[PDB]
Each structure stands twice: as C-alpha cells, then as structure tokens.
Design a protein around this ligand. Sequence first.
Ligand SMILES: Nc1ncnc2c1ncn2[C@@H]1O[C@H](COP(=O)(O)OP(=O)(O)OP(=O)(O)O)[C@@H](O)[C@H]1O
Ligand SMILES: [Mg+2]
Lengths: 51, 585, 592, 464, 226, 49
Amino acid sequence: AFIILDEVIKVTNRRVNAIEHVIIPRTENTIAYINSELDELDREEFYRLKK
Amino acid sequence: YGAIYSVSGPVVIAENMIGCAMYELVKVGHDNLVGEVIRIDGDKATIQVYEETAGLTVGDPVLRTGKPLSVELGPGLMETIYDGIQRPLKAIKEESQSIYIPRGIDTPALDRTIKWQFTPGKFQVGDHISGGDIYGSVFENSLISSHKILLPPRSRGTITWIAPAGEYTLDEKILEVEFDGKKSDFTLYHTWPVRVPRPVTEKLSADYPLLTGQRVLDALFPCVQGGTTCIPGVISQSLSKYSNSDAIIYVGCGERGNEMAEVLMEFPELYTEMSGTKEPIMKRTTLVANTSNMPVAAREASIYTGITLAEYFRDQGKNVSMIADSSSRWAEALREISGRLGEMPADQGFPAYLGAKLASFYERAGKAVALGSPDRTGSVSIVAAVSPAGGDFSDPVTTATLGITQVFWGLDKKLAQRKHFPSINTSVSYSKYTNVLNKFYDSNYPEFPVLRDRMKEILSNAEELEQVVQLVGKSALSDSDKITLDVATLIKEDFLQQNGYSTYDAFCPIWKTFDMMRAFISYHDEAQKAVANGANWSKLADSTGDVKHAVSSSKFFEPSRGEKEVHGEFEKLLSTMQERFAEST
Amino acid sequence: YGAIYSVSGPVVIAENMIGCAMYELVKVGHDNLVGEVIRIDGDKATIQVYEETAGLTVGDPVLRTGKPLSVELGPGLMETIYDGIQRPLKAIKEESQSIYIPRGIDTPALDRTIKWQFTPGKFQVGDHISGGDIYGSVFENSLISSHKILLPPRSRGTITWIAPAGEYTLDEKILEVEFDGKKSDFTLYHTWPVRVPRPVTEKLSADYPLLTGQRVLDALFPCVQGGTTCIPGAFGCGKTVISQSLSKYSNSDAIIYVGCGERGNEMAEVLMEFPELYTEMSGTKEPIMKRTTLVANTSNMPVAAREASIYTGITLAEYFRDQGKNVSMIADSSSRWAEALREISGRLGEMPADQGFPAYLGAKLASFYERAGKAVALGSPDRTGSVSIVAAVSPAGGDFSDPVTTATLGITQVFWGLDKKLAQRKHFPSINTSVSYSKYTNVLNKFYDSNYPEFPVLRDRMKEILSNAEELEQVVQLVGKSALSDSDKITLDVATLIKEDFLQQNGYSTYDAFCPIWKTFDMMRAFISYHDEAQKAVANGANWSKLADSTGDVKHAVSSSKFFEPSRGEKEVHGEFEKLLSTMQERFAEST
Amino acid sequence: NKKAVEQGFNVKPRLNYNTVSGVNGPLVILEKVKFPRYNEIVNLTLPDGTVRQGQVLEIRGDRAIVQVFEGTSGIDVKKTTVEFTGESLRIPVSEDMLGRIFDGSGRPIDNGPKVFAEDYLDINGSPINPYARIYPEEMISTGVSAIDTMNSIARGQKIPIFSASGLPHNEIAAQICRQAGLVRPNFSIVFAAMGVNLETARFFKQDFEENGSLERTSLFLNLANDPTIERIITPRLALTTAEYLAYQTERHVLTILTDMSSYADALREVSAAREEVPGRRGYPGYMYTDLSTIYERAGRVEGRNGSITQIPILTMPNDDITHPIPDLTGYITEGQIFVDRQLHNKGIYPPINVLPSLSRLMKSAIGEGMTRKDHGDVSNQLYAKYAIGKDAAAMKAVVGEEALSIEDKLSLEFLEKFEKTFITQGAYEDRTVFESLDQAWSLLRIYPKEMLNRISPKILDEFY
Amino acid sequence: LTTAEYLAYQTERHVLTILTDMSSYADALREVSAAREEVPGRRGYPGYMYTDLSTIYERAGRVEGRNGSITQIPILTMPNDDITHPIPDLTGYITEGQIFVDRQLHNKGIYPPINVLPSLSRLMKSAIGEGMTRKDHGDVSNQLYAKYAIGKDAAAMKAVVGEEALSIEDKLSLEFLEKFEKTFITQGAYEDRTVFESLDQAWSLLRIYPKEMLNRISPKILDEFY
Amino acid sequence: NREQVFPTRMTLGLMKTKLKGANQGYSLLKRKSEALTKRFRDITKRIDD
Ligand SMILES: Nc1ncnc2c1ncn2[C@@H]1O[C@H](COP(=O)(O)OP(=O)(O)OP(=O)(O)O)[C@@H](O)[C@H]1O
Ligand SMILES: [Mg+2]
C-alpha cells in the first residue's frame, strides 16, 4: 500500500506541476494572443468605417 | 459673441465666431453652458459642451471666455469641495437651494464676498516684479496660515501701486504692474490654464521622505516628498491626516456617487489625528469630487485641476500630497472622450495619447524651487490609486501607471481577506526611492537602510521556508530556518499588522519605526547567534518568550511621549533581550 | 510638362497632365524625381515618386516621359549594385563624391564608356530575325562569358546590316532590322517595362534541384531550379543568411540579389565578401561577385521604390533567363515590398482590406511569383533557362498569420518556415520541420533516382523519425520520460542527435559553410544507419542505456561527421564516410 | 577651402501668413499660401506672443497643413501669423556642440549661448549609399561579459537594448558608454532623451559628469513635460549631430536613443491624429520606415574614419518581443540586447537574457585576428548549453529534479554557474573579452569534452 | 428615473426603480447613435455608452435635504454570458455591487437561480447593521458565503478523492451546500421571506455545524443565536 | 508558448472555459496530492512500526 501510494502521489504531483507550469502559462498566452488578434480585427474594422 | 450653427449631440458648431482660441472655453447657449473648442474650420468652431445639450437652438449666442480650461487659483481653496472643472459645489447648493446642479451655473469658483486680511510683502511701489514673486500674504485658515499671494507666472513688469494692509474682497484690485504700459491689475486671485504646468525655477531631486504614518509604507516601501506613488485601491485616510504635507488635494471620490458622498462626509468629520490638537482635516484638504453623473470632460479634468491646485500650493513653498483615486474612472472618461472624438483606438480601445498624458501628469509632480523671489522650495507628492481593471493589471492605464510611478504599495486581496492591515503584499510591492532616501537616512537614522534590507532578506527567507513547509514536513526544516520563520511571523504580527484604529499604533512615527526595526534586528541577530551556538530551538524559544513578548509590546507602546522617552524604552528592551539571550546560552 | 498640385508623403497629385498614361514614368520636380502614375482623376494624375519628396513646391514642373518604368537590360549588369530604379550606386558615388544618394541623379543604368568585345552570332544580312533571337554575344567577364545579345521582344524583321566582330560601346549601333519598310536600329542594350513579364516560348516543369548548400533545405525540403520559395520568420531567424548562402553556393549560373527594406549593412557585407569567395564552375576559380548583381533599396530609401526594386530585380532575372542561364532571384523582403504597398495605399486613401495591406496585394504577389519558372527562351537558337524566386517573407510580430505570409504560402511551392525558438539558442538554420513543406519532392524523384537513389527514402525516414520524436517530446514534457519504451528512447536520442549535428548547420564555419548534395546524402545515410543499427541491437535484447554507454564513441563519430571539410572532394569525403558506416556497424555488433 | 560659407551670405525675406483656414487636432491648415514646400519649418506666432514651430505635411493648391511641435492649444484664426522659413527643419551644427545640453527641439537648455553653427544640416538627412557604406568589423569591448562574448558589438553596429519599464536599462546603457572601447587598440557620445522622466535624465547627466564623458556628450533632453510632437524630431536632431561629428569630423560616436518606446508612442499619437493606417496595435503603417530613418543612420562609410554606433533603449510594454515596437526595432537594427525581468527578479546584474539577445555584426569582428580564435565556437556552445539548461530547468519544474538525466543535471549546474558568475557582473567592473572567454571556457569545462558538439575539434583540442 | 426623482425628492418616499433589459436599452442607444453617422465603439456600441449609462444609473441615490431615496436594480442581459461584454463592464464600473443569475443554478433547480459566489453588494455593510434589521446579519451572511464556497469545493473534491476520504468539515459542508441550494436559495415565485425570517432560516442551515466550526461569526453572536 | 487556435469569439470562449477547468483541476489535484501525502506519511510511520 505504501509503494502504491508513493507511485500515485508522485504521478499526481507530476500532474499538478505539469498542469500549472505548462498549461496555465500556455492557456493564458493563448487567451492573450486571441484577445490581441480580435482587438486588431476590431481596429481594422474601425479604420475601414472611419474611411 | 457668436451664434450656434449646428447641434448634433454634445458637438455644437458655432458660426460667425472668429477669434476663438484652440481649446478655449466658451459660454454656449442662453443658459451659459460651458464647452471647449476642439477644432476650428474658419468661422465655424466645433464645441464639446460639457453639460446636457438638449434645448439648444440655432442662433443661441456663444460667448467667448478668452482663456482655455483654467482653475481660479487664490485664497479660499483649502476648505472647499470642487467639481472636475472647479465648480464650487458648496456655494452652488447654497445659492440654488436645490439638490441638483442647474445647467450653466456661473457661481465663481472662489468666494467673492468673503473679506481677506491682506498683509503686503517686502515689495514696495516702483520695485521690479517677476512672475511668482510673493507680494503679499493672507490669513486664510488656522491650519493653513499665511496664504502667500503670488503674481501670475507669465506676468512681468514693475510694481506701480500696491494696496495697504486691511480686509479686502477677493474681487478688489490689489496690485498694478506696468510693463510697456500699465495694462495689468492684479487681485488676490489669478487664473492658470489647467493643462499648462505651472513653471518653476528649477526642479529638484526628491530626497525628504513622505511619512505616511503606516509602519510598512514608511519602512519597507518608502515614498519621498515630491514623488509619485501607486496603489491598487485606509491608505487614503492615512495620507489625508498622518502625512506631514502642509496641504492635501483629494481628487478622488470614486466613480460611484455613494463613494463620493462617503468621502465628503468622512473628510469634514475627520480631525487632525496627526500633529495639531484642534484642527479639522478639511481645513487643508480641497476635495475635487466627481461622480459618474458629472460631465465626462469634468471627470477627465478632475486630476488636472487637482494637480494644478497642488502646483499652486507648491509655488508657495508648501509640501503637498495630492491623493488621486479612481484613476480607472479617469481612464474610462478619457476613453469616452476619445470615442466621442472618433480618435483611433490604440490598446484595448484606449486612445493613442493615454501613456503620454499619464507620463506628463506624473511628471508634473516633483520637488522644485518656486518661481520668483524669495527663494522657496515646495513639493507635490502624487499618490494615485491605479484601480486595476477587472481585478487584473492588464489595462493600458494600469500598465502606464506602474511604468511611470516609482512606488507600488500593492494592497493584497488575500491579505485583506486575512483581516490584515494595511495588507500590503511585501512580495509585489516595491519602492524605487531607497537609493535617494539613503542620503536622508545617513543624515538622520543611519542603520535604517541596513535594517530594511535585513527585513527584505528575512521576508524572502520566510517565503522560501513557507514553500518548504508546504512541500515537505515543517519539522524537517533546519533550526536556522525555523528561527527565521518565527522572527518573520512575529514581524508580520506586530510590526506590519499595526492597525490604525487603536490610538497606540494609529500613526507610528519614524523614530518609533526605527526603534521597532532595531528591536526586531536585535532579536533576529540574537536568535541566529543562539542557533549557531548549538542551543535547542525549543529551549531558546522557551527562554526568550519574555523577550518576544517585550518586542511585541514595543509596537503597542504609546508614541505620545516621544523624544528620548521612546528611545530610552527601546534601549532597555534591547539590553534586556541581549541579557536574556546570553543568559539562555 | 505639367505642374505639382499636392504633395502628401511619397505621393504627388500633379495637375495639368491630361494625357498621362497609367504607370507612365514622369519627372516630378525641378530635380527630375522618378515617379509613376497611379490614378488619373481628370487632368490630375497621382504619382508615386521613387525619391525623397522633401522640398517639392506646389507648381514644380512634371515631365511626361511617355514610357513605363523600364529597366535597361544588356551587358554590364552582372557585377553591379542598383538603387531599385536601376541606378548604379558606384556611378552615383563617383559622380557625386558624397556618401549620400542625391535626389534626382540621372546616371545611365549601364556604363556607356566601357567597350565590349562583340562576337556576331549565326545570323547575317538577310536572315529573318524574330523577337528574343540571339544575333551575337559579348564577353562580359571571365565567369559570365558570352553575354548573349538578344533581339528585344516584340521586335521583328529582316536583318539589313549587322556589326562585324570588334569592340563596341552600348550606344554604338550593333544591328539594323527592317520591318515593313521601316528600319530599326538596335544597340547592345534594350529597355523593357518591369511590370510586364518578358515573354518565353513555353515554360517547362522544373526538375533539376536548386542545391542551396544548407543541409535541411537541400535534403528535407528541396527546391528545384525554377520554383518559387518562401522563407517566413521573425528577425534573427536566419532568412538573410539563408538567402546569402544560397546566392554564394547555389548551382545557379547567375544571382539577382534584391534587397527591399533590408539594411545597408547587409548590402555592404555582400559587396565586401562576394569578391573574396570563389566558385568551381566554368572550369576555373572566379569570384562569386562576377555572376551576381544587387538591387539595393534599403529601408531608409524612399518607400515607393521597393516595388520598383522588386520588379527591376525580377526583370533582370528574366533577362538572364532568356539568355538561357539558370538564374535565381533572391527578394530579401516581400513583406517589406508589401509594407511599401500598404504605405502607398494608406497615403492614397484606398480601402485597407486586411491589416491595412491593399486589396490588390495578393494579386501583385501572385503575378510576381508567377514571373518565375523554368522556360524555353523566346527565339532561336533554342536554349532553356529558369528563374528561382526565393523570397524571405518577414511577418509582423513573428506570426505566420500575416496577410503577406498567407498570400505567399498560397502562391509559392516551397515553404521554409523559421521558428524563433530555434532562431534563439543558435540553432541555425532555424527551420521548423513540422510546418515547413516542399512540393517539389515528387518531381525531384527523377533526379534522385538518377544520381542518389536512396535520397528520397532516407529523407522520408528522417522526416518520420523527426515526427515521432516531436510526438514523444510533446508527451514527455507533460508526463515525464519514466515510461518510454526502448524504441522511443532510441528515437528521441537519434532525433536529438539529428537536430544537434545534421539539421543545424553553422554557415559561418569552414566545415559547415557549404554542405554539398553528396555530403548531405552520405550524412543522412550515416544517421539513418545509426538509428537502424541501434533499433536492431535493442530489439535483439540489448538494454539501451548499456548500448549507449558502449557506443558513445560511434555516436560521437556520427555527430562529428559535419566537420569533414567538403574541400577535400567527393572521393575523399565519401571514403571517410564509408569507413564511418563500417566502423559503426562493427561497433554495434561487438557491443551487442 | 570651404565654399559652403559663401551661400550663407544671402538674406531671403519670408512671407508672414495671417491666413489660417482652420485648426483641428495638432494640425493647423493654412490658406492662400504662395507656393508651399513639403517639409518647410514654419513659425506660428500665437496671439499671446509665444512662437510655436511647425512643419507642413500636405500641401494642396494654395493650401498647407502644418503640425506644430508644441501643440495647437491657444491657436486663433484671426491673430496667429505664420512665417514660412522656406526650408525644412535644419539644426545648427558645430563641433562646439560636444559638451552641451540641448532641448527636444534643439534649443540650448544649457544656459549658454546659441551654438555658433559651422553648417546647417537637415534633420531628416539622406540615406547613406550602400556602396559608400563599409561593413563594421571592429569589435567593441563593452566590458559586459554577455555583450562582449555572446553579443559582441562592432564599431558601426546599431544594436539596441530591449527592456521593460522597471528594468535597469539605463544602468546598463551607462555602463556601456563609460566602458566602450576597441578590443585591439575615446568615443564621442551623443545622448538623445525622448519622453524620459526627470530622474532618468538627471541620472544620465550625473553619470556622464561623474565619468568625465560630459566633455564629449551633446545631450538632447526631451522630458515627459516636453511637447509630445517633438519626440519625432529629437532623434533626428541627435542623429544629424552624430552624422556630422562622425562623417565630417572623424569622431567615433555613440548615439543613445533612450525610450524609443516613448518615441514610437508619440509617432502613434501623431498618426492617430490624422486618418493614417493603424498597422498593428495602432502604430502607423510607416512606423517601419520612420524607425529605419532613425536607426539606419549608423554605420561606417568609405573614405571617412568616423563611425556611429546606436544603442537605442526600448521599453517593451508587456516585456513581449511580439509587440510592434520591439519587433520592428529588431527587424531594422542589427541585433538587440535583451534585458530580462526574470533575471532581474532572480537578482542578476546585468539581467541580460542572451537567448533573445543577438548581434548580427558578430560573424565579422569575431575571428582569429580580431578576437581569440575560439570566440565563435565558445559563444555557440554557450548558447546551446544555456538553452539546454533552461529546458532542463523547465523539465525539473514539471516532473521533479530526480527525473532529469546526467546531461540535464550538468545543464542545470552549468546554468547556475553561468547566470551566477558569468552574466552577473559589477556595475563598475569591466572584463576584458579574453577574461570573459576564459570564464566561458571554465563553464564549458564543467561539461565533458565529448558533449561539446559545437566546438570545432581543433579548437576543442587546443583550448580544453 | 424622472418619475423616481419626482416621487423621492419632491414627495419624500423611497422608490427602488427596477430597469429591465439594459442590453435592450444599449441596443437602442446603438441604433440612435449609428443613425447620426457615428463610428461604433468597441463592440459596435457607441463610445459614449459609458456616459449615457452613467447618467441613467447615477440618476439614483439619497440626498441630504430630502427624506426620500432612489434605489436602482438595473437588470441586464449579458450576451453570450460574457462579463467582459461592454454593457456588463460599464454597468459594473458605474454601479456598486452586482447580483448574478446562474445558468447552472437554473438548470439544477427553480427560482431564483442566483449564485452567491460571484454576486456581492459593495454597500452591504451599511444596510446590514445593528439598529436596522438584526445585529447578526453581517456575520451570518459572511459565514453562509464562506461555507457555500467550501461546499462547492467539497462537491468538486468528492468526485476526485472519493466521498469517504472527505473530512468532517467537508462532509458537513456538502450537506450544507445541498440544503442551501435546495432550501435556502430555492424560493417560490410567490412566497415572501422577510429579512428576519431569512436570517432565521440561515441559522437553521448553519446549526448543522458544531459551534466551533463557525469561525467567521463573532463569539457573542454565536452564543446568543446558535 | 501558445495553443495553435484560430482567433475567434467561439475560440476565445472555449479557451476561457479551458483555463477555468485547468485552474479547477490544478486546485483539486493539489488537494488530492496533499491528502495522499498525509496518507503516505501515515503509511510510512505504520511501515516503520
Ligand atoms: N546559417 C547560419 N549559420 C550561422 N549563423 C547564422 C545562420 N543564420 C543566421 N545566423 C546568425 O543569426 C543572425 C540572424 O541574422 P539574419 O540576417 O539572418 O536575420 P533575419 O531573420 O534575416 O532578419 P531581418 O528580418 O531583420 O532581415 C545572423 O546575423 C548570424 O549571426
Ligand atoms: Mg533579412
């Protein structure tokens, strides 16, 4: 039971560290890039309407 | 007087109006609505009327003020609540006897009926006079005495006639200055364009510290007089009274009207908890209060009016601390004006000049020798609440504020939820004025920078120890790490968590802060020495529980006595702690 | 002669010019600035001047030349540097004695004083000559010898008189052609509008590879002689170095290096270094500079001239193609050409379309990239040339979603994508092997089966190894490498070796400045044989850790194979490689 | 001798236009103008008597569109008089400018006299002929190990400094100025301030005075208080001064262009004031051309010993390379020195992140005659192993430190001893390029000889 | 708002206006603005939408001279359930506090689908006082919010770590969450609950805990009410 | 360092949902790791005994 719990805890801690360090910066950067891209599209539409 | 030619929303075009300067305020309509000229196309001059533009007819006269958006600087500012464009709300209510602001109300921003006891200065008739030179003094209030009257900065010439001492109305002529023709008569008040900064002889480095009263903000993240400061937005009340600034320019009141009402009620109610027994806090603080119902131009120019008032008070040599609140609301007003003007968005819909205007506004603040004789020095400290948008520091206004402002105090939501005060996050907050403040610290309190660096290192080690205790068992930590964690916990409990509600630690002075710093440093050094000597951590804690209790009570010690009485108590506590630590070994 | 009415930026709406044609070349201002008409609104005619507009007064005369922007093809182009509108920078410097380019310099596009040895062709008096036919050749330099003189396209008739062999200048008459009773006098040079592609008899499907000299470009994503190529990537990725290396070490007969928006220091580096380098072509060691001309229009030069630079370069490439040579145009920034187009469009007032780039940007890029291709020259004698356009796109913000990059990917056939992650950490060429593609791998099977039959199979094996390792690294980076199989570990190790040794090439190192096709094929064979031997040995039962410990020497020998200098020759380098495989096979059998 | 003087003795009366067809934003439109030029600087005299200076930007038939540098506020149609100088903006340039402090518009704020001009040079300048431009191949021993071993700077290089708002870019840029010198045996610094705060400007002034460089610096201070339109012309003035002092005076010049993010913000404000294209993130479509007009004025030229090196200091908004200002600046310039917020927070000075940093003039000026023969291989190996160490650190954070292999552990150790001993350097300590190469060789000697695959084997045998 | 101003200030009575479909009002403002040849703002809405909504909102509030009041409950309709939408953003800026109706709550049960985790009132401390309503209101509301957050955490944690492994403070919190989303929040569309009755029910839910578990409530309130 | 997602409003909402789910999973898995670590410490003590 101790060995199985050690393996499970190692896998879970690796999963938490992976989730945070990889995914959360990755998804946050994707959100920022998407917001920037739609902001650029809105700015282009605004410029066309101003013209 | 011109005539209205076109009205399309708050965009009034006035024809047969030649001679209107750029950005010159005008009196639009028969109700004397105020508006600024945003573009000229010959006779026509497009005007952004501040108030509601409904009911404006074609041919309504448009009077020309002849000056841009300006603030009426002079005696009578201190105990007054103003709007964004300096509308005297108190006198407006008194005159109108109504809860509303009548459209195009022309109540002068300064009381023209009150009589001021004028005392002429050293300047006499026939003497050459320069801009900003003091030619008289006026007793305005008890807390703010000797309201020095200044010549308008652009004015120059020689003094032709100066009125003698006495009680004079604010509209009566006081000084006639001749310069290629005696075409200048100066009263006790002068107008200055709000956007145009008040000139100074020479801007000086900001060296003397701004004593906010709070131990955390006065020790770990200090601010200097004439320096800019940032707050995410207790601190506002502390700067209002505990700050040693001779004047306060509150330009906040928030976007919410309820917040404005609360601020207006609290400021007059609060007294001078700092030095000064019987003096209202409002006796030196001018409230530039603007709600969201106020005109968007007024909301955008509230901070500019406040900073111009602060520079006027600085030109008299007074240290001023202009507490700015709802900078997010100001940025929203600026974005609204940009969208009204059709200006191209730059970042998240904000205008392209947001960073430039913010940088110029923060560069207005600074210690500088006032223009004209006698040589005098003033300071304009800015403490602007950044108010991050959506709870995150991603707004362009927030980014610019953190980029130009030198101090960020970083109130923490988690720390506030933990019932901590002032709940300043020591890991996010910072202060770039330590290098300059090292001069004053060497002059007065030599060991204070070293002690502050020691606490910064202690806090970093405490964060590391907390991470270690979260990762693995707490008991696995070394004796030195445990001692450092305990010392940091005691520091957070006593030094940093000093609540201002209790009169014992309502406003910790710089000497009391240095005494607490020395006590904490001595306790940490004694603990480290005991750990190095090989003594058990538990035994050392059991022996030095009395020393820890004395250190904790040092924070609760009343600073009313002051002088060497507080210093003498710290010396006894330090000696007792050293003796107790040595006896334990 | 018109007058200037409005000057706003690089565009000049000149009034009083009824009769001006579209894209007709004009002379705006007292200094005779070079400009092209874009719009004609009545007597007004908007002009994009190709020079600096500062100092143009309302009322300045504007001459109407009557002819479009015309490059001056002919002998003397090969070893020169041009200003975008074909102004020799050497001549400008010599005439002005200043380090600057004066506004309105009207130096001839080709040196007129230089006398060229002329050798008449097979044509003589009375032979009916057609457009594009070769009626003679001139000795230009040691490398580009017999710079064949072509009859201008759309010029046709019977030869009345031909100049005998001797020495001639460009202004001297060389030929007289009679068409419908009207005699036409032809010189060594001839003008051609840059907008219109030079005609060819019939374009052909390109089949011979363009040996770039870079390992990854030559092996994984090959390019043929006569196909468009795209090189997107942010600053510092390696587009300029890839372009310069291709120009230095390509198998092309001539280079048309076009820099639009590129720094002047890159031009200075090329002018300084190309004469130092030498080529083994033509049976002798001759400088690279003798067969490459440069169209230099830097970023601080007038905005409107970038389009003129692109078109002048592509027309020079088309001329040397009609001469039957294998030319490869190198546009340094099609993105900067597009940014010039965007600036002109914004100053004019057209609809921004996407990102502000004009709506005709895609069509203009498609036409420019369609100028390229292998083709049979227009006239007899029959000879075949090719133009390979390898243009470096510069996306804004380092994202391949820019309109210029999207249009270029839509129109070109070879896409050498560059990743800034590999641009950093000094992993040049920073080619992104996942997104990059080459559509000439199918057609190149003929050349591969003719010369290196195992090249396509080895390239496919390396590509699938790289893909498997990409998947393995992706899964490992989130789930660790404590559960991988032995085969997975072998794949990861071999692909890391490939990235560190084979794919990465130090173009500024003597051993890896130019890896030829045979060396690249041999090293692919070495790496693939290493991977196969490791896989077989482990499948036999050997633990991968112990196998790596025992075969570290073989791994080092494989990874250090790049240091074999190709200057030793094919025989010497291949001899060492054959011993490398034999030793590696032995060191994998003894260990197992 | 010099025949350019004789053209000076020629008085040219200038028209005084009282006609203003209208003012909108920062642009004032004039009417009935007699033959307007396209960039001629004009002097608007406001009704209050203060004289703004503007330059025309579009000139239709008998109509001119002036943008004033000090803003249009206070301009009236009836009373403003515009005086058409008839020539584009021309800074008065003399050799005595070395040692002076000017303003954003070129006015001397040094409380001294107006510069006794030796020649009037247009601020816009002219492009340098690529044939007449020499490739800079002379290294500069900037003292900093990162900028001398991994991002070596040539004499004519225009390598900027990328940093965020709070990073010590000014501290690093001042270190380069006081330590700039050739590897194989003084620079005349030209400092341009665009929108920097008073503390930064005073710090630069005091640092130059302390190091004694103030006798060879011509500062162009344009603080945040200064008008936001003349941030455009301030770098033009600085680069005209540098172009003179180099190509006509034979002085090696450092050009410091601080807060180029502020300059580009001013450019974006000017563009959005008109109906110009928004490019990306609101910046003008011609921002590449304007930044090129700024940067490309550096370099060495044929026949003239003077050289100009540009060290522009940028301010990335979110510390992002993908932002238009750093992206276009790295596209135009010949490298960048990336100052890392992560390294600064960790405690490293200089906090230079070498992976985003680049020096395109390293290929030349790094070799067997200019620097040590191992320089290029050492630098390439250092980048390779430092990136491998960063990847290993990320993998350590993800899957614990135990899962890393021997190579990853060696990479972590190398990264620790590289950031802590090699990149880290005292603010006033300068290291010879050979000492920096020796330290780099020690860091590589951490690794075994086999794993160094970027070192040519002859160099590896000779220098290990 | 004009009728409210009349009643409250010229009649001295309390109003509590309830404006419905501020999204519909914003769309109407969009059409009125675009009819005057004006460029749309960020999400098509006019740039001065902040000023217009500020007028409409700040038309409410108390005054010193008069004994009346104007409370406001502008009920928005968030498009695509996005808070970053301009109408919700500007309304949150101008107004103080916010009440959220949750799609998950609506699917799970019946009126009102109001979730308390993202919904808060900024001037709550003034309304929940000692003389007005009851002196335990603030402590009870804070305790309920904290235990609802813990109940949501425990409901998420049950499927992760098994029901048995949850602590006592998590099992009790899950039971409280069930009885909270099913009995306290769950209210009939026609039944009226006074503030005192609602606080009594809140205490009835809070009594499933040991007296030591309730930490946010003051000890005096715990001794007097629990 | 960003997901290869085409910029769109639907994509933005999907990525916000993914971020919320990732944060929730991070918190839940950290709490599960803490519980299993307490159980593992108890198991280690029991194993020694
Ligand atoms: N194949 C290579 N071998 C060695 N070093 C290289 C190679 N490619 C690039 N580099 C290095 O990386 C730098 C990248 O500069 P380069 O001129 O290639 O940039 P770029 O992507 O073309 O930029 P820009 O868009 O600004 O023109 C070179 O100056 C050189 O130091
Ligand atoms: Mg390039």
